[PDB]
Structure 1
């Protein structure tokens, strides 16, 4: 299944995509990406659009 990440970081902006078994998985994968990329903000998830967002 395909998920998408929306980035609204003060230092990092754009979008990212990853395939996961479910949201439970994609959520941890995107946060890692943001975490490995030093992003710290507010997180939200939409299951109807399969889109995650993070904003610092």
Structure 2
């Protein structure tokens, strides 16, 4: 299924999607995506919308 990441960093902001079999797999692309762009913050997830949010 399609999972989405709401990114709210200091220098980078936006939204990205990915295809994953479950939430766990989607978190571990999205929580590499954060690392990739030097984004370190607090995380939330919404199973109903399959949406991750990372905020710096």
Alignment partner of 1:44: what SS?
Answer: strand
Q: CA deviation at 1:29?
A: 0.9
Deviations 1:11-46 (A, max 9, x none): 110000000010000001101011011110100100
Aligned-partner Cα distance in 2 for 1:25–1:15: 18
The normalised TM-score by structure 1 is 0.92
Aligned residues: 54
The normalised TM-score by structure 2 is 0.92
Q: Which runs of 4+ in 1 moved over 4 A?
A: none
Unmatched runs of 5 consecutive residues or more in structure 2? none
TM-align CA RMSD: 0.6
Unmatched runs of 5 consecutive residues or more in structure 1? none
Q: CA deviation at 1:4?
A: 0.4
